[PDB]
Design a protein around this ligand. Structure first.
Ligand SMILES: CCCCCCCCCCCCCCCCC[C@@H](O)O[C@H](CO[C@H](O)CCCCCCCCCCCCCCC)COP(=O)(O)OCC[N+](C)(C)C
Ligand SMILES: CCCCCCCC/C=C\CCCCCCCC(=O)O[C@H](COC(=O)CCCCCCC/C=C/CCCCCCCC)COP(=O)(O)OCCN
Lengths: 70, 83
């Protein structure tokens, strides 16, 4: 009666633990991958992150400058 | 409107310098926007050649760019001489 009224079968806890383990293992893998990706982008600078600004090329004046040799 | 007239008459007495200075300053602020010659001044500033006019490379599709200074094409400064 106690088991019927208050508790649940072993399979429920078993499968819930499987799901929790899957979720947290995926999270750990994603954390390692994030660290590696951050290191690579900061070292190289070829990704969307760590893009430090440079001078805009639309600021340059392309017109004769009173002197042929600029 | 009477209070304004009384105030101006009171200020023209015993304070003519301030009245004159404020009038001159207000006129200096207002008048340039109404004068028709400010555009003429801007044009005269445009017409003054400080730099060499660099010729364009003729490609057969510039009927409006002259080939010689004597050619009729290009802007004229006859309005400046008439001024
Ligand atoms: C002769 C009898 C011998 C045995 C006596 C046993 C008496 C039991 C009293 C102590 C029980 C402690 C509580 C244990 C469980 C409570 C918490 C939780 O586990 O139970 C909840 C349920 O709790 C109960 O609904 C309520 C328990 C409250 C007990 C209160 C008893 C004392 C009350 C005293 C009041 C006095 C009167 C007022 C005087 C002013 C959730 O259960 P639920 O998730 O649904 O279960 C679903 C199971 N399925 C999935 C298989 C269907
Ligand atoms: C948007 C235009 C602005 C540019 C114009 C002004 C350029 C420069 C002028 C401004 C300089 C600073 C002005 C400082 C004002 C101080 C006022 C003040 O408190 O002095 C009062 C005196 O002045 C006043 O009472 C307050 C203002 C009085 C009149 C000010 C001008 C009012 C409007 C004038 C122009 C009106 C429109 C022109 C119409 C003219 C008719 C054709 C006290 O006099 P004291 O010298 O201290 O005491 C000695 C005597 N025992």
């Amino acid at each position: 009666w106690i088991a019927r009224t208050f508790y649940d079968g072993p399979e429920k806890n078993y499968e819930k633990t499987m799901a929790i383990l899957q979720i947290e293992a995926e999270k750990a893998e994603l954390r390692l991958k994030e660290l590696e990706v951050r290191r690579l982008m900061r070292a190289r600078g070829d990704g969307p992150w760590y893009q430090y600004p440079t001078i805009d090329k639309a600021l340059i004046d392309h017109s004769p400058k009173t002197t042929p040799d600029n | 409107a009477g209070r304004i007239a009384s105030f101006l008459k009171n200020a023209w007495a015993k304070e003519p310098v301030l009245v004159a200075s404020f009038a001159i300053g207000g006129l200096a602020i207002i008048l340039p926007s109404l004068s028709p010659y400010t555009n003429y001044a801007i044009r005269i500033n445009r017409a003054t050649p400080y730099n060499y006019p660099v010729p364009l490379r003729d490609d057969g599709n510039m009927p409006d760019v002259p080939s010689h200074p004597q050619d009729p094409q290009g802007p004229s400064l006859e309005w400046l001489k008439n001024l």
